mmCIF file of C-alpha atoms in Angstrom:
data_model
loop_
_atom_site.group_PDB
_atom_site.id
_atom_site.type_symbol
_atom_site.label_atom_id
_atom_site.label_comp_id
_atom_site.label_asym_id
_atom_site.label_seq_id
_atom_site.Cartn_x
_atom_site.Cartn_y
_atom_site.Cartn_z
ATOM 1 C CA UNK G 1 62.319 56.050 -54.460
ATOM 2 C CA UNK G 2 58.711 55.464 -55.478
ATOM 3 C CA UNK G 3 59.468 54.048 -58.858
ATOM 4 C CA UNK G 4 56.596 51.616 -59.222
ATOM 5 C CA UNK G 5 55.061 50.647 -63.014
ATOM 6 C CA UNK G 6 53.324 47.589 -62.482
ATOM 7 C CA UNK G 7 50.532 46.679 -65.358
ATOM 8 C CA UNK G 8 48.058 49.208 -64.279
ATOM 9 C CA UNK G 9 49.634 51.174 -67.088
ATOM 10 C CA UNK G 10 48.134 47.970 -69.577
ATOM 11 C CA UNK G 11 44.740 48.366 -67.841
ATOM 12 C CA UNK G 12 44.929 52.102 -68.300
ATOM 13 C CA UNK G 13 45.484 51.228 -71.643
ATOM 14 C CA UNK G 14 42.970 49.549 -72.129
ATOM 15 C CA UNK G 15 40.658 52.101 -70.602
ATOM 16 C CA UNK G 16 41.755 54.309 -73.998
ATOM 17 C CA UNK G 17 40.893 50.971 -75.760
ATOM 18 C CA UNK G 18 37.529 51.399 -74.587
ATOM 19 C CA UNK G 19 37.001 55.138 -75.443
ATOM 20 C CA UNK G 20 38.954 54.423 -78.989
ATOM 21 C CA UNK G 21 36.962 51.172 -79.420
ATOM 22 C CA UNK G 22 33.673 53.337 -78.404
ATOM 23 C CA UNK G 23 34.564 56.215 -81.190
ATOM 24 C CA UNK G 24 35.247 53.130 -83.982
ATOM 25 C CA UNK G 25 31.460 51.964 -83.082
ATOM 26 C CA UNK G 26 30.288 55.734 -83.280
ATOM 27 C CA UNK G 27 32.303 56.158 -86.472
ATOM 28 C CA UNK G 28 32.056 52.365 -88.038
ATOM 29 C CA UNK G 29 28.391 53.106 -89.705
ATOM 30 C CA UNK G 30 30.071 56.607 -90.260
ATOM 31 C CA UNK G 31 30.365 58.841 -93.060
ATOM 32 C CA UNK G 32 33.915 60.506 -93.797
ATOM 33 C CA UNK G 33 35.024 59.958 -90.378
ATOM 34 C CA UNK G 34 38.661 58.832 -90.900
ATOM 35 C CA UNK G 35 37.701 55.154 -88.619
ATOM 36 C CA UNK G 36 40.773 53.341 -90.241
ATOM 37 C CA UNK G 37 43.842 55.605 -88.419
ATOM 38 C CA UNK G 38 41.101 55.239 -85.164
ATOM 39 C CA UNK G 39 41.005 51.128 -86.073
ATOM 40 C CA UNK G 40 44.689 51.292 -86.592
ATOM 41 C CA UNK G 41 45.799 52.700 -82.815
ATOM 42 C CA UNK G 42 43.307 49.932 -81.917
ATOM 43 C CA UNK G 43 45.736 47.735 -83.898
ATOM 44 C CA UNK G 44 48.638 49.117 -82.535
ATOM 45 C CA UNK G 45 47.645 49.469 -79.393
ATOM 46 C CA UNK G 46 46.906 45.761 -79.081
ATOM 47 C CA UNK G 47 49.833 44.713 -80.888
ATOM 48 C CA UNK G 48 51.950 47.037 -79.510
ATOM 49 C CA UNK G 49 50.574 46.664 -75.939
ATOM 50 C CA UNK G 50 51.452 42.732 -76.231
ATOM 51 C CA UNK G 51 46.837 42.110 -75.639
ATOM 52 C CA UNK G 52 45.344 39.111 -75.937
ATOM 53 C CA UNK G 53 42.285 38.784 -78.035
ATOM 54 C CA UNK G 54 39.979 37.908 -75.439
ATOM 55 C CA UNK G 55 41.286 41.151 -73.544
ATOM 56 C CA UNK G 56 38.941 42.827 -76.029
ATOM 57 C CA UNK G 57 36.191 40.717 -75.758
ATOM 58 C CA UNK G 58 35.511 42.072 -72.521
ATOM 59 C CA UNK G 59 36.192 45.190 -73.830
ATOM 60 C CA UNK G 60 33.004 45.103 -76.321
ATOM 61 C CA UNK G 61 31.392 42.672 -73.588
ATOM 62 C CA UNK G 62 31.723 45.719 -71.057
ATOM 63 C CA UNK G 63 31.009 48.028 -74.021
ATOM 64 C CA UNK G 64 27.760 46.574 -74.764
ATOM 65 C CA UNK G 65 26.818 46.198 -71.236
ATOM 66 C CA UNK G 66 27.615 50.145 -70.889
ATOM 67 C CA UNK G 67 25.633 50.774 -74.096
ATOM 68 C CA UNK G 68 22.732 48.577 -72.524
ATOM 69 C CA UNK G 69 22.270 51.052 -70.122
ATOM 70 C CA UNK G 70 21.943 53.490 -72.737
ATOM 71 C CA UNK G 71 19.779 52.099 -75.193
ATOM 72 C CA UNK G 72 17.448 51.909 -72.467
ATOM 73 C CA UNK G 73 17.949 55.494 -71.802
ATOM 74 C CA UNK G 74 17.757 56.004 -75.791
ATOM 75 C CA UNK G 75 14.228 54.600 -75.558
ATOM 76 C CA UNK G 76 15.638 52.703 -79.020
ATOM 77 C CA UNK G 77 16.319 49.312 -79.677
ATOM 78 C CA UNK G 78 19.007 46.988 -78.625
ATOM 79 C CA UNK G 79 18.672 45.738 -82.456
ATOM 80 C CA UNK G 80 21.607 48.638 -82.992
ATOM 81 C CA UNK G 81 23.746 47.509 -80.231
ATOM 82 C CA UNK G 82 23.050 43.776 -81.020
ATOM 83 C CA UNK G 83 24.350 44.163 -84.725
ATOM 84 C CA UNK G 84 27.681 45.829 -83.135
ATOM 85 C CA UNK G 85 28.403 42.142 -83.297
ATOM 86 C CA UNK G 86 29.878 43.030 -86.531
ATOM 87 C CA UNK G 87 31.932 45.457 -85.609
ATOM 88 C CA UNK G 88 33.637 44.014 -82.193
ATOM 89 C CA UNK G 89 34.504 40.659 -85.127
ATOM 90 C CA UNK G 90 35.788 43.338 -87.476
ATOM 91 C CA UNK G 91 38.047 45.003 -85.124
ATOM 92 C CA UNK G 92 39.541 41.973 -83.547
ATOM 93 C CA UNK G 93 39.565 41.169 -87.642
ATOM 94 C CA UNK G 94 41.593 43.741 -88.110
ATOM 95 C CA UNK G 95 44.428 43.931 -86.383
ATOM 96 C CA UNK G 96 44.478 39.913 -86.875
ATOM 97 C CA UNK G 97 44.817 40.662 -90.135
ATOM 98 C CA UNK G 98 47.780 43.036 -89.406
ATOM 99 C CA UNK G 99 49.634 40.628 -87.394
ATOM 100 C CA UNK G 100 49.426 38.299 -90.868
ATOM 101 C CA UNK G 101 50.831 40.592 -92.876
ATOM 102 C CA UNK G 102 54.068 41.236 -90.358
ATOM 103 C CA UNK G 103 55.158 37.498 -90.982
ATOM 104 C CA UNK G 104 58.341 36.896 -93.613
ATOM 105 C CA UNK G 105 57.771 33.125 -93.804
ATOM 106 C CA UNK G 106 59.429 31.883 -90.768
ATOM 107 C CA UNK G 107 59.950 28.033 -92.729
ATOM 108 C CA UNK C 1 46.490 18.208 -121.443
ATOM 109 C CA UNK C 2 44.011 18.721 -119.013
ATOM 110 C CA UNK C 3 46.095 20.444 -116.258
ATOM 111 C CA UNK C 4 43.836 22.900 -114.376
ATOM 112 C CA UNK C 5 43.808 23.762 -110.452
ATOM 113 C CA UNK C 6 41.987 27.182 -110.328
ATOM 114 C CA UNK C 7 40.758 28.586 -107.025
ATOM 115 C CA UNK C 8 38.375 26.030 -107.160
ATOM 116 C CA UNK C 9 40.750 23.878 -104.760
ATOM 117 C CA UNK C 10 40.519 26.709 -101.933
ATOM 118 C CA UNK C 11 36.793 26.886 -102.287
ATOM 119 C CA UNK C 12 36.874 22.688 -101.953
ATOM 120 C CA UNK C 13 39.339 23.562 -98.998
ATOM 121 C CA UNK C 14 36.256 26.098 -97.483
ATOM 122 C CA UNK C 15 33.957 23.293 -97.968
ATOM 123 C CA UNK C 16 35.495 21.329 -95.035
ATOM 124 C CA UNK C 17 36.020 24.186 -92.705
ATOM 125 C CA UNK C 18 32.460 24.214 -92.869
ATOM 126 C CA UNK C 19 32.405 20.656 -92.138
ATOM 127 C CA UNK C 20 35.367 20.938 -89.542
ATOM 128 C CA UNK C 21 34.379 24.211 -88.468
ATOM 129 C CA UNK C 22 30.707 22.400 -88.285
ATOM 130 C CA UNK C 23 32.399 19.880 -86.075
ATOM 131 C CA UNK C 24 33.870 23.074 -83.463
ATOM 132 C CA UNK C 25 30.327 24.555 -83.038
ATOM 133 C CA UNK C 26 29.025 20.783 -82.127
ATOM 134 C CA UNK C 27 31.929 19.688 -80.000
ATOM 135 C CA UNK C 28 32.820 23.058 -79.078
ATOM 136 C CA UNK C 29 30.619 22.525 -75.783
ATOM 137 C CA UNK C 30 31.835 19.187 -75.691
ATOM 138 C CA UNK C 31 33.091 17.169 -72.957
ATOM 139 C CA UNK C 32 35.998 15.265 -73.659
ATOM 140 C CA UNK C 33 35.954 15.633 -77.643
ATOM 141 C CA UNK C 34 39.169 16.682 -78.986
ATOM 142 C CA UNK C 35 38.280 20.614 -80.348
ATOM 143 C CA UNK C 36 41.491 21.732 -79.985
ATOM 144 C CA UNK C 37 42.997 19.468 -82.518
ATOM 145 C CA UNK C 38 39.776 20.335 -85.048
ATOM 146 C CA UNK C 39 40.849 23.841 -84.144
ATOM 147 C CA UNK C 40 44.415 23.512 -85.037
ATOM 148 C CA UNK C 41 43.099 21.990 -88.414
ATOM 149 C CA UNK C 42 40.944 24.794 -89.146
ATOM 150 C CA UNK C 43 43.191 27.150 -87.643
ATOM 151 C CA UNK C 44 46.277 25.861 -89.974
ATOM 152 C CA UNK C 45 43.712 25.389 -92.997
ATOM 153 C CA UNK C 46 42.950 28.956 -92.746
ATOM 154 C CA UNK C 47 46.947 30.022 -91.931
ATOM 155 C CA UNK C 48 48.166 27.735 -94.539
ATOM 156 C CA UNK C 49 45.045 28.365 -97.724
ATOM 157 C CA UNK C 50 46.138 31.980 -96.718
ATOM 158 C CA UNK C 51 42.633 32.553 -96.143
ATOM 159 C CA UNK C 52 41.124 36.076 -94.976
ATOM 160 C CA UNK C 53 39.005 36.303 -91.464
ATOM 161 C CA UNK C 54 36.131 38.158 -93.730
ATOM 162 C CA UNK C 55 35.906 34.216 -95.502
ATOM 163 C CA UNK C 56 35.120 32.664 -91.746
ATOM 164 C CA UNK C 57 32.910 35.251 -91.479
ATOM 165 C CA UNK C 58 30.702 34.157 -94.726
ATOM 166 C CA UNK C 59 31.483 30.383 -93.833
ATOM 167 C CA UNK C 60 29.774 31.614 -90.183
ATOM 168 C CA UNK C 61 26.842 33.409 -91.715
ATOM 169 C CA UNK C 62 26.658 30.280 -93.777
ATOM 170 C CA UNK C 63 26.339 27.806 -91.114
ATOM 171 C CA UNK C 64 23.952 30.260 -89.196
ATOM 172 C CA UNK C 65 21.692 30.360 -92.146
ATOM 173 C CA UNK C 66 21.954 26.516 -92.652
ATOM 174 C CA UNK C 67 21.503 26.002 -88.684
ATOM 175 C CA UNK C 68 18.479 28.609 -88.930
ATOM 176 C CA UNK C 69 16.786 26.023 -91.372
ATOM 177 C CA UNK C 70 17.748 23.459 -88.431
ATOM 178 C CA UNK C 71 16.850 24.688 -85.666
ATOM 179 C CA UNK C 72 12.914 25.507 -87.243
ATOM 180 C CA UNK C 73 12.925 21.627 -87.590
ATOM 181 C CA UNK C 74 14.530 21.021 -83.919
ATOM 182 C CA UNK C 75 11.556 22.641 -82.890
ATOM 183 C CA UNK C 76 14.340 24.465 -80.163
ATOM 184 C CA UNK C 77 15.472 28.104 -79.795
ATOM 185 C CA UNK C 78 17.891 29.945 -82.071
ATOM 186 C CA UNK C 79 18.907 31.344 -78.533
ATOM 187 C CA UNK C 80 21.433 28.178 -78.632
ATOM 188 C CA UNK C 81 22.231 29.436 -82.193
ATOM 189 C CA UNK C 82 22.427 32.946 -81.226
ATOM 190 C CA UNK C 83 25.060 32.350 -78.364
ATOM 191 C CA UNK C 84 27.370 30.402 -81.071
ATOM 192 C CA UNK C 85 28.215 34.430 -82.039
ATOM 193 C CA UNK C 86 30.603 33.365 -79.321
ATOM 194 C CA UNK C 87 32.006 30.383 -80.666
ATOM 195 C CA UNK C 88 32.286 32.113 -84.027
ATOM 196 C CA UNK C 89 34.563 34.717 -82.942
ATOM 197 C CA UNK C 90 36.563 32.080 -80.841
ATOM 198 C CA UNK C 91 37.168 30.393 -84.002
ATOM 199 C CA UNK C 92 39.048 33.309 -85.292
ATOM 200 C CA UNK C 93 40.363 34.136 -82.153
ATOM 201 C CA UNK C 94 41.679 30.655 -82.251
ATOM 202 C CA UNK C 95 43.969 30.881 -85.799
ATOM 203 C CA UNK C 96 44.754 34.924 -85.257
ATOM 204 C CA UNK C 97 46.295 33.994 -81.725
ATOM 205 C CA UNK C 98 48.586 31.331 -83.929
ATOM 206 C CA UNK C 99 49.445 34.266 -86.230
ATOM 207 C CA UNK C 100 50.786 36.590 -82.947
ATOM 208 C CA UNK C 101 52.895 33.532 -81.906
ATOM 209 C CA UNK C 102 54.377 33.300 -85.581
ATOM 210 C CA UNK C 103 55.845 36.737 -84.935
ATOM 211 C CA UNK C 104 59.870 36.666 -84.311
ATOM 212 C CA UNK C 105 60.134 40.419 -84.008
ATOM 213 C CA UNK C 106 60.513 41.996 -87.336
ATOM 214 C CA UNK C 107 61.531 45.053 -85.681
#
């Protein structure tokens, strides 16, 4: 019997969105760190996974309130975390600019 | 002779998403103004002047700066200013969703 999906499998999804999302921001100001096939699962992940924008606005919203507790921990400055702002725009950026690029003039 | 279009038209075209886009930020905590259709403009400007999110970005970062000279004279808080980061990433939000809807399974 049991069979039994329901969306939890989207949320767990997203909960890899999260730790992908959290590598891009570790790896964005990186070095040789190969971010763009970890951006692209993010893009295909919320292409493929049929998510809405504002799905990962929470994401970073719930990213940067995670990281808040850090930074504070980090004795730093919230001056790293605040230009991240960059980064959530970029990633939401990119895939955007995927789904642009997967349209043969519809007329 | 004459006959010369250039890119100059798509920078003209920028000009008024600053203007329209100008006219989200103010009406975008509205009450009864009609955003959405402003949206759509701006949203179909950038779809249809095949413009790049990155050029929203500057035309953001624009405004900001021009707002930053504002708000000194308003005498206010770039807090108000500094919560538009929002609004901002609405905007492109706004157009990218339009892009995800244009999509008749390429397969």
């Amino acid at each position: 019997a049991m069979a039994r999906m329901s969306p939890a499998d989207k949320r767990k999804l997203l909960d890899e969105l999260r730790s992908i999302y959290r590598t891009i921001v570790l790896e964005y100001f990186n070095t040789d760190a190969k971010v763009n096939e970890r951006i692209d699962e993010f893009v295909s992940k919320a292409f493929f996974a049929d998510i809405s924008v504002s799905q990962v606005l929470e994401i970073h919203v719930e990213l940067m309130d995670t990281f808040s507790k850090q930074l504070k921990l980090e004795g730093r400055s919230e001056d790293i975390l605040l230009d991240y702002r960059l980064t959530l725009i970029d990633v939401i950026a990119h895939l955007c600019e995927m789904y642009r690029r997967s349209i043969p003039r519809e007329v």
